[PDB]
Design a protein around this ligand. Structure first.
Ligand SMILES: Nc1ncnc2c1ncn2[C@@H]1O[C@H](CSCC[C@H](N)C(=O)O)[C@@H](O)[C@H]1O
Ligand SMILES: Nc1ncnc2c1ncn2[C@@H]1O[C@H](CSCC[C@H](N)C(=O)O)[C@@H](O)[C@H]1O
Ligand SMILES: Nc1ncnc2c1ncn2[C@@H]1O[C@H](CSCC[C@H](N)C(=O)O)[C@@H](O)[C@H]1O
Ligand SMILES: Nc1ncnc2c1ncn2[C@@H]1O[C@H](CSCC[C@H](N)C(=O)O)[C@@H](O)[C@H]1O
Lengths: 253, 253, 253, 253
């Protein structure tokens, strides 16, 4: 039951993915021209061929596909870091999240998927060009129902009340700690992602000032090694992404 | 609206958590005796005092509290590893998951929380004492509605059809690859956690045999460093958990 | 040609080492009493037996044995860190090194071994109990000929001239930068080991002030993983020493 | 007393090094032409200028400069790995080392520097073009006195006797274990560098066969992180070299 306007992932013989809207149009590939209207009426698992006879397999888009093919700026939160945010703050279906700044919306997409259609994410942003980019990513991924972008400076305050988590990727998360203490419910998490150890120190100094409002904070950083596994040789990949940012957690009350 | 039989987390002045069922009983602490009936009628955020005048703050249990206080055996999947499984396989609210072996239920609790009340997890297990331990953990955490434990050897087959993910923490995941190829929907993930590099090699040799059923597999391992952040000194903690297991992902067709 | 008063390493059937001075005495072990005079006249490679028949093999002490069996306080420079100091600063036979503070002498032993009998290490120290501990370790290891300990505060100056390397494990290495610029020959290294990232920042600010005296500084930290290699399972050891200190290098002129 | 035919390091205003032989020639640079005869008669620490007025400072070449500027092939042992070899096997001035294969001579240069003018390194090699490349590097660095290259296959045997260390960067170090057991003195080290975990497993199986000849083997791998230290931000460098090879040590008797 694939209809016109539906999104679909096409998979190459090389295993390359193309995330595509189904329409009566020509799609130009590396490996020939695809007649997209052929997809209509077909099912996931089936395939289409280019004019050169190369086969493209049809998959339902998953969160991994939207995240991988998203339009982005240079600074995003990596899936490995979003993964640890979700895990250590216990982010759950139905949660209400305040986040800032929205950026390209990578973290936002990840979180919106996790809280599900009855959860909510409100993301503050001060750059209208990034707000627009993120909004387009979020509509494209199908999460406009649960995510709202505000063009507003979160250092001036958080309008929301009884929130589950306040999640920051901002230059100065210490300017949000007081607002978060008021906005968060008992047991909710304050979480901040910060590239520099200078940021971590300034954040911790603020959290110490607010020690009657939070449990003991914890700061981590995560590294993921890829393994090269061939018939005659397993070893880690030679180079890795070794640093993106520190992640600090503080539980309210 | 805290009623009798409700679960509650009590937080120490030291920040220690006690995950408790509310009844009219006496609770014995490090810091004196608590009269749990006093919790009844109270609200989250409020507090109770021990007979020695020590204050215990009252929180709603979150997934982090269940995971942290769970009854466990010596071999569990760590939250950092569960986090990366969820992230790289795109595990989402409503998903249908086959898992084995259930173990103590740690990975199962984590996944059950992510898939939500309309998702499902079916966990196979061959040791009835672990099946019982996991079942008691899952009922305690409130997930009996969405998780089912089967006392059955998954090497003999997977009954389920059109599953989103098959997720393994088993000595021999290569003996499940064919069953998973049949059970998984197009685009679903096979994921296996394995402590030893020998397991990774055997698994990859099997996935190569089934290269027509899966995209190119990926194997990772994740390390999380804790930071020590004091007024005058920030540095990583001296010692870390540096290895638990490798994680392999292969996407179906 | 093993004589009385020689030092010798005795190796257990379990592979445990005992670094011992050969005299006509009784040595009490886990595995029985050893008659040490029986070593006299023997050669390296041969063995002695305890009164319970357990065999102790006789080796010549190497630097690894002195380092491993040295009397120490709680804060030393680890061999892995000393290794990188030697490597990245190009520490060589015949070099003249100024070091501070001596501590237990661990770094000093390592460096003294590398510069050889014609190199020299001068180590400054302000605590006389540590100066004595280090001196006893250095005499025991046979390096009194090339190492001198000074009971003097290196923040007040370095007397030495045309030195190859100034090597610091001190709370405030920035108070030594100016003295080191004067003491070092052209192309010599300033090197500083520091546990905290706050120390690294203060040091780098000082080195920026002295940017006309040094090349661009480099700061590293080193992690060594142990592998567990059994017949049926290879994997990294579960836990590791993941942080000791950062190491900063700056080459003079 | 810089005379003609001497080697010198020239340092750029940008901090770039040029390792050069002093002759009456013209040296063409990025920053103008250098009249190299001007160096004659001068001292280390002084400078030459290009015709364009840019200053090049004069340093004595150190092992770090030879290692950094060496002509190499694609596969060398990294200084961090050579560092741990030296450290954990206790490689010392005066040692006699057998090494294979010589490669580009990077490990050989490192080791030759450590053993000093009275130590010896004998390196076996089976490819004549690499033997020649290494020989040219070793003569250039000034170590022809202490290093000998043999065009010979070390799997056929080690001619040398009472050696301190046998040091391997070979596809199959297990084919050398028996020869090393015979060649090594009591307490000498067998050391092997291997990129793949499969090599580590085959090597350990051979060392278990020879367990009456060696103490318990140890396998490590080393990672060095670079830190970025700017006035307003300290953080690890984003990317790192995360794997080169494992290093296995076994002490003879
Ligand atoms: N005070 C503030 N309030 C709201 N947004 C802010 C802010 N200060 C900075 N920002 C925004 O925060 C963003 C940091 S980049 C955030 C990237 C995002 N986490 C992603 O994964 O795609 C920038 O877009 C910046 O404009
Ligand atoms: N073939 C098989 N089918 C089902 N369970 C199996 C199995 N082989 C081993 N097991 C079970 O797999 C488990 C591995 S320990 C699993 C721990 C779990 N992931 C947690 O986080 O708590 C054991 O309980 C073992 O009994
Ligand atoms: N200004 C100063 N001058 C000389 N020594 C100093 C000093 N400030 C601190 N110290 C000494 O520096 C030492 C730091 S611990 C050094 C450990 C040593 N690197 C080892 O490996 O064993 C202490 O012994 C302290 O007493
Ligand atoms: N059996 C054998 N005997 C001697 N050399 C061998 C050998 N098998 C392989 N080799 C050589 O071993 C080398 C591996 S590359 C060694 C690189 C070297 N450690 C460096 O740092 O520069 C190659 O030059 C190869 O020709």
């Amino acid at each position: 039951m694939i209809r016109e306007g539906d999104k679909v992932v096409l998979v190459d013989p090389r295993g390359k993915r193309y995330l595509i809207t189904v329409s009566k149009r020509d799609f130009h590939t590396d490996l020939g021209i695809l007649k997209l209207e052929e997809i209509i009426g077909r099912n996931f698992g089936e395939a289409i061929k280019s004019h050169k006879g190369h086969e493209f397999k049809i998959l339902r888009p998953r969160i991994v596909d939207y995240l991988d093919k998203m339009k982005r700026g240079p600074q995003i939160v990596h899936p490995k870091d979003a993964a640890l945010i979700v895990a250590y703050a216990g982010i759950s279906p139905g949660d209400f999240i305040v986040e800032a700044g929205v950026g390209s919306g990578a973290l936002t997409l990840f979180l919106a998927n996790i809280v599900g259609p009855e959860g909510r994410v409100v993301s503050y942003e001060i750059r209208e060009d990034f707000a627009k980019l993120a909004w387009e990513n979020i509509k494209w991924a199908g999460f406009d129902d649960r995510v709202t972008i505000k063009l507003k400076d979160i250092y001036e305050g958080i309008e929301e009340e009884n929130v589950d988590h306040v999640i920051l990727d901002l230059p100065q998360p210490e300017r949000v700690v007081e607002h978060a203490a008021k906005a968060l419910k008992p047991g909710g998490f304050f979480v901040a992602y910060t590239p520099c150890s200078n940021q971590v120190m300034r954040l911790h100094e603020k959290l110490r000032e607010f020690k009657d409002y939070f449990m003991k904070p914890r700061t981590i950083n995560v590294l993921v090694f890829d393994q090269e596994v061939k018939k005659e040789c397993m070893r880690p990949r030679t180079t890795a992404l070794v640093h993106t940012g520190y992640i600090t957690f503080a539980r309210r009350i």
